[model samples]
Target chain A: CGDQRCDRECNSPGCGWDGGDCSLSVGDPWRQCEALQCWRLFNNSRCDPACSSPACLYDNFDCHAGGRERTCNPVYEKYCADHFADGRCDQGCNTEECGWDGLDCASEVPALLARGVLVLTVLLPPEELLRSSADFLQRLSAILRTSLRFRLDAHGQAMVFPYHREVIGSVVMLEIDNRLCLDHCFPDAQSAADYLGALSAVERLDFPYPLRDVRGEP
Target chain B: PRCPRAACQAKRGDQRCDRECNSPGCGWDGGDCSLSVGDPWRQCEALQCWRLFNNSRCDPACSSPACLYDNFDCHAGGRERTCNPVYEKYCADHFADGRCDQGCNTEECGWDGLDCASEVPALLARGVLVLTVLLPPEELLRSSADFLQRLSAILRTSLRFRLDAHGQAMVFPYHRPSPEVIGSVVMLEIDNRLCLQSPENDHCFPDAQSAADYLGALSAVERLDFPYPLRDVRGEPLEPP
Candidate 1:
């Protein structure tokens, strides 16, 4: 029963390997010390040669003084390592093409584009857009104005909209600076996709004359 | 067998000798028995003798010497005397005795006899003469000057009458005149009287009343409007009835 072929020997179920070798690796030397049933190197003292495996000659000495072993789960380790590398989570960039590796790219690309298009449309010169497009935007602004009045019945003075790119940028920067609007207006992929669909629908419409109703005039 | 002088001496000593060997009469010694000379004390006998002597020989006897009034022999004649008129009628009633029996009488000496009545008037007249003789000329002049000054003040107040611009007789207002004005007026009046009364002038009829009447006419013409309130003649309010 004690032979390599036996259940308690080399291929024994009780002696099953935990994933990797319990040797000093290029990244973490104290990895898998407990899973290997190697007790001596589990503490923060000098790694003993006695706990070395048959293939690896390196000793599991104390790397950290008197400290216990850190049980590193893969998910937590990746998250911590990423956080250490960057001050925040990398949301990639405001690129035209989406990089998806079998994730939700079908939904994610349109959502990201919608947000990027919204920012770009605000920055575009108002004179460059078709008069009909400008008219459609004006009507939409009027509808929003009416809705905001109804929403803020007692606070009519607080309703506002930036008509120019500089004004819009200032507003967006204020919101982002205060963390008031994080992850953009459409917070998640599904909502971003829905917003993109609605905006595309608006762009396809036709008109003749531009609307003149603005905040400054009567 | 003693000598004759010793025998005589023994006889004299025995005649005077007492228990202390002193003589009872001559105060000479005899033997152990003695005697004192003169009278022996008779208890309160010395006082009795003194009282007897006072009663008999003293000018005012001890029984009742002179005190204040007639009752106490005020006249020194040992007669009871009556009050004198020099003490006044009230004094006669109150201090009836010559002694001036009570109150502040009897301090001055005056006879209670009938001669005091005749002599009192003469004595007062003589006292006036003496006062006149003793007065200094300067003192007399000062007195006369004081009299003239007071008289002049009276005259000034009485003679002055006021007449307003309307010529109606008005009550004189009594503004206090300055001291200089008052003194000057007094001196003028006095000098005027002296000049008139001088022997060279022989103006005897310049009476004070006549002089005051003459000054009154002048004062009526010369009287200035007074600036203060005047007390009326009777010292009633001049403005009211």
Candidate 2:
């Protein structure tokens, strides 16, 4: 991606230089061409010039993806997917992480990912709770499905959306989001809750029923 | 123009017969015309002989008032000289009451067991529901796009109480999420004259007694948007199936 540079050749329909009026300044011989550096897997796909291999690549691809890029170090060049094996990579840092290709791409570091579970909980009134909860959870599942479908369609990746739910009286707790462990920090009041309140609404749940214009009878 | 039942032996290819009930099991009966609403529908049976016909005859439940037929006698059972029938009806026993005694004296009412075989009401085939996108001109569809999140919810609104209309069963809007789709127009293919107001409020259908007047039993949401140009296809005149 770096000094192993080759001359720009434009052939595709969207190819060729911006010729100044576009992304670049006028007359600048450097024409615009879709570049490829980091394998995009996040909010953005625009590749950077320094993304050239062997060079230090600071990534923001995603908290998960970019943090993992740090595995591509001076040692293992093709790492991340395979390199983070047997305590191979370090579970990365929050502070702008690096895409350091240290030993080899398939190597080790603290910038690895966790193969675990997630939990989330929200509160709503008894009457509204069931429907609202189903709606939200369904939405999450749909987004997950979309993401998985896109991955499968675009890259032939296989994946699943979710896998339980149980309840106790008026309260329901399901594993749905990443639970941040605070071994390094907090006496966090975020999880500690004495949340109290009464839920009410303009109560005459009047809605339409017995829909019209059916076939027979008349 | 008298309307009475027909007693004759008729029908079909090389095995076709006439003069009398010639086919096997075309048994004779000295039955009465006293019909009732509680009878279960005749089993939908295949003909016993080689022709593979339907075992629906006039004697047992033959002169059903509203049965859709391919073609028949010019005028029979109160039908016009020429008619296209839905051949559908609901059980009348539960429906006929004191309120109609004065106005309705001599009329064959209720589900004609002779027709649907029992009492199943004729429900219309609710075909395609297409919501065409107009702005951005044909924006619902476009082929040349690198990629698109086409199936995202473009429009969705929470439940709104219809002050003017509300039925015991059809009060809808349990977070009616807009369908996830990608196209200029949304085409939802479903068979429904009714949908539940909410998951828990599931009874959108009528009971046999109430459904006796099937067409009237249908709620107000089902209106033919006439001026909207009902057609087989755009600009194509609507013709009966």
Candidate 3:
């Protein structure tokens, strides 16, 4: 009775509404309209005669009186209507075309950083020296907690690895998006804390410029 | 242990200030004689030092607020000591208690107060990936140092080559680039050889994806001595000149 054909033999409620092929009853609302082909006709900006009734929220509001006009940049016509101002940062919309993604690419620095994660890797001295100096270690720990905990907790993850050999002090390395950005050594925890505090305020770490100078133009 | 001087022995708490008994070694004359230091003198219970309390420097033993918060040294500007917000989970009241708190294993936390004595894994420790370059016997005869120098300049990562047990020169990079970058490097090397080989056949990959596939297949076989099409960092294949 649920055959593909909507013949008189299978139009009743007995056969799963003729395999959802038959139109809904007059008393049934648009929300109950579950025709197999109605999914494609709903909210697609075009109203099919079969789904124009109030049963499907008048085709899920797509068939309303006034529809939003879609505008797109000529250079990036394909990404105009759907992706513009969609609250997502699409790299394709970062160019002059598409109006630079309609503000998705523009964001405040600290807010952006708050949303981003920094992966901090700290390398420490040998285990023997660290284990022996409990008082010294405690003081260093207090200093680190005060300096790094607030900033890192705001937007970062921290990790530690002790060098197999003595390193005299500690070395801190910072990575963002799996990219190594900074590596430096500090003689004491206070020095490390100061360096990290200053780092939190800088926009760039100065890398490629140094690389270029080191290379010296072949 | 008895006092070193017989006169000071048992003279403690005798209400008689035996001059020899007033030293810390003599238990401050068992509270018989007052501190020789000036007023506001207090003795640390742990280290047993007779000094003016609330000095600038924190005595390692006396750190509580009753001891002027270790003379405000532990407090660091008269502020309460606060643990790291993230590490507080692992270090709050648990530091140096003989248990190795995993979160405390950072320099900021005294490497878990030395409890975690074992070597732990370094962050971002990507395992080694070896690439064996398959060059002609004559090409192999050339100095590996020169070859590696050129490779390092092109890849921007330090690389070294060594003769493996099987006599193959395996190249290792200190930092691992993406698989696509590795493919591009191989293609660039192949282009160098092709230029030297007279570019007779001019065979090249159709695109970067194809070149990456070729490199992947080569890597799967553990044999990486061939060149395919050239691609840039963006995976866009370069057209043959």
- Candidate achieving the largest DockQ: 3
lDDT of 3 at A146: 15
| RMSD of every prediction | 62.4, 28.6, 32.8
User: Residue B227 in model 3: shift from native, Å?
Assistant: 70
How well docked is model 2, in DockQ terms? 0.00
On TM-score, the leading prediction is 2
**lDDT of each prediction vs. the true structure?**
0.22, 0.20, 0.32
By summed lDDT, the worst window of 10 consecutive residues in model 3 chain B runs over B188-197
* TM-score of every candidate: 0.10, 0.18, 0.15
Off by over 4 Å in 3: A1-218, B1-26, B29-89, B92-110, B113-117, B120-241
| Model 3, span A1-218: residue lDDT tens | 62423344554434443553332111112224545455445435575656544333334333433233222233333333234334554444333323334334454422211122222222335343334332222222222221111123334632323433355333223211111111112223323322222222121111111010000010
Kept native contacts, as fractions per model, are: 0.00, 0.00, 0.00
DockQ of prediction 3: 0.01
Give the CA lDDT, 0 to 100, for residue A55 in model 1: 18
TM-score of chain A of 1: 0.16
- Please write out the lDDT profile of model 2 over residues A1-218, one tens digit for every residue: 01111113321113322221121111221112133433231124333434322111211222223343422232222122121112222122111112111112223322222222222222333344443332333222222111000112245432212211333122222221222221111121111110000000111111111111101010
For model 1, residues B142-237, the per-residue Cα lDDT tens digits are 343232222222222111112346964332112233311111111111112211233332322132333322222222222312211111111111
Between candidates 1 and 2, the lDDT winner: 1
